[PDB]
Amino acid sequence: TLSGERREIIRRALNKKILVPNILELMPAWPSEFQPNIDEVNVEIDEWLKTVNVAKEKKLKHRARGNYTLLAGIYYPHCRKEKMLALSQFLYWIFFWDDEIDREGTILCCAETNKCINDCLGPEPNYTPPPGSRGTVEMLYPILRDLRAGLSPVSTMRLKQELHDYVNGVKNQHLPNPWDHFQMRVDDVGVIPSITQNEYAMDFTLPDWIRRHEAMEEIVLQCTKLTILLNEILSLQKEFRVSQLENLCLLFMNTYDMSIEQSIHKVLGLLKDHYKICIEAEARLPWSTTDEKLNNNIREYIRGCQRLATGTACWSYNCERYFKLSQLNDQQELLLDLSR
Ligand SMILES: C/C=C(\C)CC/C=C(\C)CCC=C(C)C
Ligand SMILES: [Mg+2]
């Protein structure tokens, strides 16, 4: 039965301590940087959060442990400070929304959220939340409006589809097979809208014909996979402690009777594989022989993709969403601790 499988995983992983190498070292060509106005933007974010209709203690737990302005600051380290506000607000939205979301309640929330996405990003814009909107939907209307104000319709269409994909993936969601779990996250994970928001952050539009080029599709895919893989390792302690066993490390343990150490090693191996694929795709991009602006846009778009992966790791090593920062030693090696 499913309960026997879950119970045995818990039995095998309980109280295990695993030292994880610094994941940033597995992506050595891709540097991590910090937007220089994070503190100033956080002051704005704190004033804004007072107006958000999410419980005070919940907003504060996210602000304290997640501190998503820092995440935006690492995703978008070269944007101007004026862009940082909407970018930080969006991350507060998606984490609040994911937190707050009972099959009926989920279906209703997803429908109201998809409606907001259509209202704000679709061909007949309406930025006014319907009366009686829940807090995590009401707050999304002005965020999408502000993002759309700094986006071409080309980029807006991609953001719209990507947000629908995220919301519908949440709606749709034996222990599962590890590869089924991985592929589901590759389709469903909320990271692609962050790649598109680099176009907002750096005020440019990547043309569709380049976005659809096999090598650019590959880079987006590889960076999505890399972000998932490192998140599986970095979130293992958090998820195991609330008995959320659908973590890739535990699924490798279950399906293949791997030890927890072997399974983490396997995920780290996949990270290195997909990084090398990603790097090799750059040579195949349709770089222009003449157009500096176009090539700067291609460069910025792929740096945005790479920063999703390095930035999610770097942020995880600089906040307390996933573990206590005392669990890092002086080499940024993480001592996971699956105690309860
Ligand atoms: C799966 C979580 C991560 C890869 C961390 C970075 C992800 C985002 C910034 C958007 C996803 C938001 C969620 C609440 C899952
Ligand atoms: Mg996770």
Curated annotation (Swiss-Prot):
Binds 3 Mg(2+) ions per monomer. SUPFAM superfamilies: Terpenoid synthases (SSF48576). InterPro entries: Isoprenoid_synthase_dom_sf, Terpene_cyclase-like_2. Disruption phenotype: Abolishes the production of koraiol. Keywords: Lyase, Magnesium, Metal-binding. Mg(2+) 3 binds at N231, S235. A motif (WxxxxxRY motif) lies at residues 315-322. It catalyses: (2E,6E)-farnesyl diphosphate + H2O = trichobrasilenol + diphosphate; (2E,6E)-farnesyl diphosphate = alpha-humulene + diphosphate; (2E,6E)-farnesyl diphosphate = (-)-(E)-beta-caryophyllene + diphosphate; (2E,6E)-farnesyl diphosphate = (E)-2-epi-beta-caryophyllene + diphosphate. A motif (NSE motif) lies at residues 231-239. The keyword Transcription regulation does not apply. Pathway: Sesquiterpene biosynthesis. A motif (D(D/E)XX(D/E) motif) lies at residues 98-101. (2E,6E)-farnesyl diphosphate binds at R321, Y322. Its cofactor is Mg(2+). Mg(2+) 1 binds at D98. GO terms for molecular function: (-)-E-beta-caryophyllene synthase activity; alpha-humulene synthase activity; metal ion binding. Mg(2+) 2 binds at D98. It is an enzyme of class 4 (lyase). GO terms for biological process: isoprenoid biosynthetic process. The 2 conserved active-site motifs D(D/E)XX(D/E) and NSE are required for coordinating the divalent metal ions that stabilize the PPi moiety of the substrate. Terpene cyclase that is able to convert FPP into a mixture of sesquiterpene hydrocarbons and alcohols. The main product is trichobrasilenol. Additionally, side products include alpha-humulene, caryophyllene, 2-epi-caryophyllene, african-3-ene, african-1-ene, isoafricanol and pristinol. Does not accept GPP, GGPP, and GFPP as substrates. PANTHER family: BETA-PINACENE SYNTHASE-RELATED, TERPENE SYNTHASE. Homodimer. This is Terpene cyclase 6. It comes from Hypocrea atroviridis. The gene is tatc6.
